[PDB]
């Protein structure tokens, strides 16, 4: 459904589409998200087309994340944000719009930011027994 040939991020990697580049190495490319939900909003992507988190190998995942602190620190040093978020969306129903794995690096400046997490705990819907069974179910499936 989402092939490399039709992928806009692969087109950026291949230079057919322009980007405002923040960092590049053999494994990853980082460039500004044109939406700029906050000033300096940056995307970190693997050069190899992987659709979402479930398709990353350990090596690609390592290469992607290994550059995040240095990029976050650069944004921090230059724009002095009060906070910072990382976000990744997988699946149309979870907000994914470009089907090439990417992490959003989002600096926060305060009250008037374009990003915010709506967050609600469902803690009391679970007993101790329930959590133990959810945890072992996941644990036993980890490859």
Q: If you compute the radius of gyration of the chain from its CA atoms, what whole number of angstroms results? A: 17
Q: Is 21 a binder of its own copies (CB under 8 A)?
A: yes
Closest CA to 34 of 24, 46, 22: 22
- Site track 74-113 with Zn ion (rule: CB under 5 A), x = hit: --------------------------x-------------
- Which residues 79-138 are close enough to bind its own copies by CB under 8 A? 81-96, 103, 108, 110, 114-123, 125-126, 131-132, 134-135, 137-138
- Whether residue 90 contacts residue 54, with contact meaning beta carbons closer than 8 Å, is answered with yes
Residue with tokens 């907000």: 95
Nearer to Zn ion, 29 or 67 (CB): 29
> CA–CA separation, 1 vs 100, rounded Å?
12
100 annotated to a ligand binding site:
yes
């Amino acid at each position: 459904n989402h092939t490399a040939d039709n992928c806009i991020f692969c087109k950026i990697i291949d230079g057919q589409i322009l980007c405002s580049k923040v960092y590049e190495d053999e494994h990853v490319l980082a460039f500004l998200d044109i939406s700029q939900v906050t000033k300096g909003h940056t995307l970190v992507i693997p050069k190899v087309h992987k659709q979402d988190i479930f398709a990353l190998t350990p090596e690609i995942a390592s290469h992607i994340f290994s550059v995040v602190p240095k990029i976050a620190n650069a944004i921090k040093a230059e724009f002095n944000p009060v906070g910072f978020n990382l976000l990744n969306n997988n699946g149309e129903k979870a907000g994914q719009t470009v089907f090439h794995f990417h992490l959003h690096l989002i600096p926060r400046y305060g009250e008037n930011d374009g990003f915010g997490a709506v967050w609600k705990s469902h803690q009391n819907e679970y007993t101790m027994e329930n959590l133990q069974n959810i945890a072992s179910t996941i644990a036993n499936s980890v490859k």
